[PDB]
Design a binder for this molecule. Structure first.
Ligand SMILES: OC[C@H]1O[C@@H](O)[C@H](O)[C@@H](O)[C@H]1O
Ligand SMILES: OC[C@H]1O[C@@H](O)[C@H](O)[C@@H](O)[C@H]1O
Ligand SMILES: [Zn+2]
Lengths: 688, 687
């Protein structure tokens, strides 16, 4: 679609948007003036409202009431505050689920999903779609050409709860999805391997979604499962498009977005694909507690930018402190509030918003942090939040808008479909999923002072000096060609275990692994060597000769090309048949460029190997560990203005080479004329 | 309205001592040996027919009493009283087969089938009909039979069937809400149903909290709280109906039902049920390991608490192993007698076991009894006979109707707060209310102080000191009670996770503790949960006095000017916790408030207690030995004092001898100077 960013309200300029989900309909209206006074003081200029306000709008069937929403929207507009307005179709009222219990989702075992939480609806319910499009229309009509509304928030995190439906509506939809994608039943049969275990289909009507097949010790069809995960994503996407189609039909000036859930571990929605149906990309992200906090946020924001194809994106949600939804919910430390928002910013967001504005007293999210805590305006959270708005106006005025995150030296390929494939319960080990490997390489590259671009698989990683292929389990013929070309012409590639095992339908490649691509990699593998502690005396690690250690899984490399060089070998009990086998290799292919990594090494084993491997490939690398102490993230204007952010990645005070330019921002950090000083959780930004 | 069961025609008053008794599982030719062996053991009551429904109403509407008459006659002739059940605990196969609509449904709509017990819907009109009929039939048939000294109505209501989601549950829960709230808006307002489009147009839209999709999903916290309240109230209404039918036909016979008070029990509101029984009776089974002693003393204290210090009846406990855990350990030598003495010392006037004769078959076949499968030549039967003897001695020494003395400190227990801390969207699933009171009780025991565990509506505000441990719900009134208690000179220990929400689970605003910050002197803007969920997570916080907080800590932002800080957190500065306040004490008029800003554990509390108490002005022996023996004291109106001493340790201990006559000793040695207890020993004196 074409890129349409939300624009300012009639009269004032373009700013970094800074706001929050806002839910006045959970408080007495008399609170709305205080809300707005405190927003202004904070630097807040947009809020998103009505996201789950369905049952306070269509108060009963066919009956729409807009007064309370009309009143508060008026107060916000008069205050200079924009409205990112929802469809309010995210979750239905009790009256509707009562009259039509047929809209309720069904899990793999046919359990009914009742109301009492949210999103208890079947994505492909014809009835739910009807009520829903009606509300979308009603809303669009009523706020047509109301000028406070600068954009639409259609629904809410589609599929967060209702990805997997197994109801009769879903059965019907998965059938037709399969007909539309495969054409003939023979082709479905051939993609799924249905001659195995007498699963062969006589017709499209015989096809079932992968409902319960009896638990542990039972193994559902993997190809059918892969496709079903694909269908689920597309079913929700289709629903979204029908809703957006209705909203811009009535108010075509207003750009539409929906809020994604990009994080290192998200493993449902195919968001690179969804991104093709939004005027701008916006994301919800919540910090991962502990050591992974920083690298995993950077990773996710980088990825978002990747899906955005380096266009500006909108951080719709993140948290000021604790979430509510983990089994343990830690608070943020001093500085992390500001520093996290800065990271999202540095990775290309032109907007920064939280869930939520005012902490709820009751309901299931009552313990989720907000900008204004229950403790009230005399709280450290609110003080930090005010500081943030202030820094975001500063950045706006220095002119950062619409600058793009710069092109890294190395692309790290992330691939959701591979993630799905690696999820089957009959793989060589359940201890290996695709999602962790890209994250480790990103963390490892941060350790050596190189900030990578996380890039989805259909993006242009083949225009980078180097790419990481980390457990890209599905390799199609085309994917194989793309990598072969990238390497022929001087590309340098890092390829790992669990890469290129199967075609795109989860049919394993023959003649040895990596499949399709073995000529380029220079390595041949006849089987895996999974490792663990399931049973007493099991082989549970493999030492590597460079002083690292592999866990969970290793490849058994049988032969290498004559021009393949071994950098590292496994060191083990000879009887294991792994002693002296190749663990890390590098192999020339024309002008490039391939290192193969035959096991899971983790952030730190990757990171400790990285120097010897980069040297072998001709990738310049700082070999000093200090090099990773600060993470440097850069945005570039076409006019040549450069915004460089520095972040302490460690738990001790650090000193960095000061960039040239003007200091725009500082949190837990000290500028000097020579060198720059950051405390833990501290951030700096300069314009050059 | 306290009615204790009385002796049979002719007998004197004795500590009751018996067991569940189930002759309907054996050939009648075994009964004379049962009774014989009972007499040798000192047994003077049995409870029978508790699950004998299918052997009484053998088929629909057919009631048969001959076997029960025969055995009750042998028992009567032998001098053994009968605590007779309604036998309505669990229905026959013919009933559930004819009427499968009585069957419970779990949150996912699963039928709960027969094959175990208590598979019934609490609010099944059909089942209620059958049960109340049987109740009547029993009552009719044993009207004015002098063998029957009491009624055992049903059995452990809600042990299995607390949570029903059937249509009967759906309907009753509506009506329960209609009645508790009046108008649908008061509901909407209690539950915060404007969040996530939950707002209700009517009562007919209210549903019980059935499955909303497992992990990653979060049901309405107020609706869940109230549903837990409802589940307890539904079973209670049912019990009252059963007892009403019984006491109407035989009004002279006192009625009870058996509770399951233990540290971690978390369903029935028992303090609330205690209002519908003629005497309070409890089932308790030991917690294996270290916690064996303190967790029994705590549970028994709490039952007395619920009884408002009136005598209570230990209906069930075990001689050795239970059957129902994943590992079922046996009791060690001495624990059988010592355990019964702990319950006695905490105010019980009856001591009975599950069960009399170990079963050869059925699901409880490996559950221990008084007469083991090994037979009469067993260590368990030998100890039982000794216990029987000890209890006759104590009856003769005049212990009956003595009350447990008023301790210096009350420890507040609150089932409704436990229900609240159970919701899956709290700061951490690692914190529940129940553990904390238990830690403080154990902690005082470590310092030679025996506390009274008290439910929230009991009179803790008449003690020198009260403990408020994870009392997450504070109503306005609760807040006023505490304020008054401290103003008028009471001293209070308050912890983290206290006073977060009103009674509807709605968070207090303006900072925590809510409502009560004027009295506590501390202001908290958010929590700092700790754990190991993810690598590098903050998983503990040292405290400056040498203890350690785990699981959860409060972030104390400000303290009142007259607040004194006793200990601070010590952390990595980047955490924003280093040097923060961890234990504080604060004057409020004539009391009296110490704040403990995290989970310390038994040992952390115990190690801090001296300093806290000194600052509060509560005398405390600073020596660790002080907790080597637990002293529990019962007092007669006439001035008689019964003092029991118990070894809490695993090595021999020596204590000051009480004055008076020595009544009982197990694994212990009276001397004229000082007393000697072995591991697991108990001693008793009258003074
Ligand atoms: O952390 C909680 C938040 O998670 C967001 O992704 C969701 O869209 C918000 O409504 C809120 O639920
Ligand atoms: O410990 C085993 C016992 O548990 C009791 O609570 C129950 O009422 C008895 O019948 C038996 O099941
Ligand atoms: Zn089920």
């Amino acid at each position: 679609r074409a890129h349409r960013w939300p624009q300012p309200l009639p009269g004032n300029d373009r700013k970094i948007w800074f706001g929050a989900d806002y839910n006045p309909d959970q408080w007495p209206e008399d609170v709305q003036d205080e809300d707005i006074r405190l927003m202004k003081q904070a630097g807040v200029n947009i809020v998103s409202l009505a996201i789950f306000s369905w049952a306070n709008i269509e108060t009963s069937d066919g009956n729409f009431e807009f007064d309370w929403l009309d009143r508060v929207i008026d107060k916000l507009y008069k205050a200079g505050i924009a409205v990112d307005l929802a469809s309010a179709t995210a979750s239905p009222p009790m009256w509707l689920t009562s009259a039509h219990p047929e809209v309720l989702r069904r899990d793999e075992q046919g359990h009914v999903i009742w109301p009492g939480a949210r999103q208890h609806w079947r994505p492909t319910s014809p009835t739910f779609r009807t009520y829903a499009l009606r509300l979308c229309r009603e809303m669009a009509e009523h706020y047509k050409d109301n000028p406070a509304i600068v954009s639409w928030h259609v629904g809410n995190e589609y599929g967060c709860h209702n990805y997997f439906d197994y109801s009769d509506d879903a059965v019907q939809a998965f059938r037709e999805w399969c007909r539309d994608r495969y054409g003939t039943i023979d082709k479905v049969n051939a993609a799924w391997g249905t001659n195995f275990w007498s699963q062969r289909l006589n017709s499209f009507e015989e096809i079932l979604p992968p409902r319960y097949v009896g638990g542990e010790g039972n193994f559902t069809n993997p190809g059918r499962l892969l496709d079903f995960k694909h269908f689920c994503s597309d079913a929700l996407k289709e629903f979204f498009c029908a809703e957006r189609d209705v909203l811009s039909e009535v108010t075509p000036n207003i750009p539409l977005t929906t809020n994604f859930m990009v994080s290192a571990s998200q493993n449902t929605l195919d968001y690179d694909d969804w991104a093709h149906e939004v005027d701008f990309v916006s994301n919800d992200h919540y910090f991962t507690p502990g050591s992974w906090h920083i690298d995993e946020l950077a990773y996710s924001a980088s990825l978002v930018d990747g899906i955005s194809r380096k266009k500006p994106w909108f951080l719709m949600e993140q948290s000021t402190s604790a979430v509510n939804w983990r089994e343990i919910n830690p608070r943020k430390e001093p500085g992390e509030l500001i520093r996290d928002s800065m990271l999202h910013l540095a990775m290309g967001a032109d907007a920064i918003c939280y869930f939520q504005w005012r902490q709820s007293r009751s309901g299931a999210e009552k313990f989720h942090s907000a900008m204004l805590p229950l403790a009230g305006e005399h709280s450290q959270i609110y003080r930090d939040v005010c500081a943030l708005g202030a820094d975001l106006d500063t950045l706006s005025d220095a002119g950062i808008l619409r600058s793009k995150l710069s092109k890294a030296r190395v692309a790290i390929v992330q691939d959701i479909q591979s993630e799905w494939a690696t999820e089957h319960t009959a793989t060589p080990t359940q201890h290996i999923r695709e999602w962790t490997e890209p994250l480790d390489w990103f963390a490892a590259f941060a350790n050596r002072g190189v900030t990578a671009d996380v890039t989805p698989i259909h993006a242009q990683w083949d225009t980078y000096d180097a790419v990481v292929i980390p457990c890209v389990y599905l390799f199609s013929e085309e994917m194989a060609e793309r990598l072969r070309t990238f390497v022929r012409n001087g590309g340098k590639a890092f390829v790992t275990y669990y890469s290129a095992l199967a075609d795109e339908h989860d049919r394993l490649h023959t003649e040895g692994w990596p499949g399709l691509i073995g000529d380029v990699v220079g390595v041949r593998i006849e089987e895996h060597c999974p490792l663990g502690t399931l049973f007493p005396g099991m082989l549970d690690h493999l030492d590597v000769s460079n002083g690292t250690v592999v866990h969970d899984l290793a490849d058994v490399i049988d032969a290498i090309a004559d021009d393949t060089t071994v950098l590292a070998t496994f060191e083990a009990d000879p009887a294991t048949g792994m002693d002296g086998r190749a663990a890390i290799t590098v192999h020339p292919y024309h002008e490039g460029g391939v290192a193969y990594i035959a096991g899971k090494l983790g952030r730190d084993g990757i990171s400790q190997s990285l120097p010897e491997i980069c040297a072998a490939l001709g990738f310049e690398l700082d070999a000093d560990p200090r090099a990773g102490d600060v993470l440097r993230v850069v945005r570039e204007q076409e006019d040549g203005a450069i915004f460089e952010f520095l972040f302490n990645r460690t738990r001790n005070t650090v000193t960095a080479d000061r960039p040239a330019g003007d200091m725009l921002i500082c949190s837990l950090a000290t500028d000097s004329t020579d060198k720059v000083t950051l405390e833990p959780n501290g951030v700096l930004a300069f314009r050059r």
